Amino acid sequence: HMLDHIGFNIADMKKSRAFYDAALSPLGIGHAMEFGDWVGYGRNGKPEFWIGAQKGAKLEGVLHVAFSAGTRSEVGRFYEAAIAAGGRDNGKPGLRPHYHPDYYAAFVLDPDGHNIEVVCHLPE
Amino acid sequence: HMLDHIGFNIADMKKSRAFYDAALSPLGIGHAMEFGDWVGYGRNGKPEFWIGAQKGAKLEGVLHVAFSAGTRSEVGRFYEAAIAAGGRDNGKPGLRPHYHPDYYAAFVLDPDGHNIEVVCHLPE
Ligand SMILES: N[C@@H](CCC(=O)N[C@@H](CS)C(=O)NCC(=O)O)C(=O)O
Ligand SMILES: N[C@@H](CCC(=O)N[C@@H](CS)C(=O)NCC(=O)O)C(=O)O
Ligand SMILES: [Zn+2]
Numbered sequence A, B: 001h002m003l004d005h006i007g008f009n010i011a012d013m014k015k016s017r018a019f020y021d022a023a024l025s026p027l028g029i030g031h032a033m034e035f036g037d038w039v040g041y042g043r044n045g046k047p048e049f050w051i052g053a054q055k056g057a058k059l060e061g062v063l064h065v066a067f068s069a070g071t072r073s074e075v076g077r078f079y080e081a082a083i084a085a086g087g088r089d090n091g092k093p094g095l096r097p098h099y100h101p102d103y104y105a106a107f108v109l110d111p112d113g114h115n116i117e118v119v120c121h122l123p124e
């Protein structure tokens, strides 16, 4: 994999932490680490996804982040949990064959409007 | 790995494409794919890092993206190439032991001010 980690600031840590806690839980993802004023999500102690809430530093415009799912069931569970936590629909779980024949994904906007996806690339 | 891919808009495709072409080349990373109005960087046909240049849609604020290096030599070569292409220094190649004892990295700002890192986590 070419991506090691990413990080960005959001408006409100309480709100964003709650969203990502709920959204990423079905992927077996939790707080891999909390370094200073950042919260790092990851699996098996390896953080890859960092959010911060530095005053005035929040990202503006839409960032797209896609997380990897091992199963289509995980895609669906991410979606349900993210919506329930206040995420806004940006595309229901389903095949996206215009990308490739086995691309199965769902899209939810986070509290700052970022386009958060979970995708499985495998046939089932 | 939990990150599948990311994407965001930048101000000027010619400038950003040139920067990332130069910066990511030492990692064996090139244009894995060009889908519509986006440019996808990746290795072995698998795009992970997408940039676009939609009018008015550019990301504002600082995004941090770190790419994985297999060797410390690669970290250094990324840095030299990124600087030569007009990147701004945000941290020279070297150990960052305050992260962990084998963390070796360099940081360069892209044309839009994003904090681009290449990191090797292995002892050498
Ligand atoms: N509503 C669409 C969302 C598709 C989407 O957001 N795709 C990602 C890339 S995988 C993206 O950033 N698209 C930007 C665009 O399509 O303009 C769906 O349900 O498929
Ligand atoms: N100038 C520093 C840059 C360190 C840096 O940018 N670290 C990343 C995380 S690996 C970051 O986003 N840091 C934000 C901060 O330290 O406030 C260096 O050379 O080490
Ligand atoms: Zn996507």
Ligand SMILES: [Zn+2]
Pocket: A005, B064, B065, B066, B117
């Ligand atoms: Zn970093």
